[PDB]
């Protein structure tokens, strides 16, 4: 399974003076979220209803 994300910055100072290296945090938490969703559902259901 593969997906894609689109992101946008609102408050710059939290983007600077917080957890560093943004794309690292974004990607490297998205993977965990994707596992969390993909886990519970059966193989056939993932095959059929992957988009809703």
């Amino acid at each position: 399974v593969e997906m894609n994300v689109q992101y946008r910055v609102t408050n710059p100072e939290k983007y600077l003076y917080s957890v560093t290296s943004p794309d690292d945090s974004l990607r490297q938490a998205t993977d965990s979220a994707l596992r969390g969703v993909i886990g519970k559902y059966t193989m056939d259901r993932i095959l059929t209803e992957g988009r809703t």
Binding site: T48, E49, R51, T52
Partner: protein, 56 residues
């Protein structure tokens, strides 16, 4: 005098489409769709700085 820049915020273009996008029925059947969108700028004040830049 010094510099003349007024980029005209055109009120004429209303043509936007989606080339090819996918969707799904209730019956677990695939059905590709295509459509076009037409839209007119309505109130200019909020519109500008509602985008920051007039780039379409």
């Amino acid at each position: 005098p010094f510099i003349e820049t007024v980029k005209m915020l055109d009120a004429r273009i209303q043509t936007m489409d989606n080339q090819a996008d996918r969707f799904v029925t209730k019956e677990k059947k695939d059905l590709i769709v295509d459509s076009y969108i037409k839209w007119r700028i309505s109130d200019f004040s909020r519109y500008y700085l509602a985008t920051g830049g007039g780039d379409i």
